[PDB]
Design a protein around this nucleic acid. Structure first.
Ligand SMILES: [Ca+2]
Ligand SMILES: [Ca+2]
Ligand SMILES: [Ca+2]
Ligand SMILES: [Ca+2]
Ligand SMILES: [Ca+2]
Ligand SMILES: [Ca+2]
Ligand SMILES: [Ca+2]
Ligand SMILES: [Ca+2]
Ligand SMILES: [Ca+2]
Ligand SMILES: [Ca+2]
Ligand SMILES: [Ca+2]
Lengths: 155, 155
RNA sequence: AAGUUUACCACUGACCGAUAUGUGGUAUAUAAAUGGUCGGGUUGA
RNA sequence: AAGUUUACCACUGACCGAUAUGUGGUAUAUAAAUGGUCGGGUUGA
């Protein structure tokens, strides 16, 4: 994987981890964003699932925004396919190389977040969210057990 | 000289160049800012004179700002002595090492523009102003002849 | 797909302090990314 | 101290064009610094 690219993840990942709170892979159709490599173990990569349910995710953003705060758990931006996507940073999770199926493409090119300023903002939000998750913060009552996944990946 | 430092220039410079439009050096009491070294000749340095006449220079800035444009010829910023200074980028000029008298000081330390973001903005404004001056632009009818000075410095 | 609880840790430039509505980090604090503001301070335009 | 006339050159990301109210550069354009918008285009949530 290359940083800021979008990818499809093998269903095998989801059946191996068996976590009912990960965003469903929709049979290898949900694009996932590769945010950054883990600092502590090489070969573990942090991914963020996307959703196109903008009406739903805008309301969640506006919960914070309407109180004068940034939303770190969701970030909505127009991708290079010219449509808006929600990055569910809240639901980010770790993965290893063997679980990656392929590049997510647009007309046979690799879709990726080419706008560096958007990538940078997303990366910051993700570091913050991951920091908070590691310290036991729960943004929803249905939060994936990324600690369990992370330990399983430690091969 | 070190980039972003303030300096006093020898009166000898001003009597040698005899340019009535350079900002008067007030008998070696006008601080001057060292912006950047000349690209074409080492040992030639571009300087910017300062003025504390903020009321006057604010009006000149607002001529452009009031039409929605940036002012590049004048930039006003609070220095580390906690007072506002006008950088008369319009009146910038070249100099060589032998015309520098000494560091401009605050309580025996070297006054300099430590706020990098301000230094960067000023450097950009200066590159633009110098570019325009080299192409014959005249911001005032009383503009120093920096070409003549620049040639004299070449020796 | 559904699901909707923002924590903690440091940092904020003449120099000496302080500080968040600013900066970044994620168990680390000689890091990273900021450089505003307030008090002291101050030859010089 | 007084003095108060903003030019030109390129650049604006799946890909192909275009563009300044955006980016930077100063005689250079395989540079630098930006990455919005419009038109085309588009398996997948
Ligand atoms: Ca794009
Ligand atoms: Ca379109
Ligand atoms: Ca300062
Ligand atoms: Ca003060
Ligand atoms: Ca510091
Ligand atoms: Ca301090
Ligand atoms: Ca403190
Ligand atoms: Ca450091
Ligand atoms: Ca480019
Ligand atoms: Ca283009
Ligand atoms: Ca063009």
């Amino acid at each position: 994987m290359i940083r800021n690219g979008f990818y499809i993840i093998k269903d095998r990942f989801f059946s191996d981890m068996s976590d009912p709170y990960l965003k469903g892979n929709k049979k290898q159709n949900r694009p996932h964003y590769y945010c950054f490599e883990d600092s502590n173990y090489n070969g573990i990569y942090w991914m963020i699932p996307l959703s196109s349910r903008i009406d739903k995710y805008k309301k969640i953003v506006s919960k914070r925004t309407g109180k004068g705060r940034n939303c770190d758990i969701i970030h909505i931006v127009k991708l290079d396919d010219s449509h808006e996507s929600a990055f569910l940073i809240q639901d980010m999770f770790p993965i290893s190389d063997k679980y990656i199926e392929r590049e997510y493409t647009i007309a046979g090119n690799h879709l990726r977040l080419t706008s560096e300023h958007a990538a940078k903002e997303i990366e910051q939000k993700a570091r913050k969210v991951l920091g908070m998750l590691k310290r036991g913060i729960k943004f929803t009552p249905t939060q994936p057990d990324i600690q369990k996944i992370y330990e399983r990946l430690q091969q």
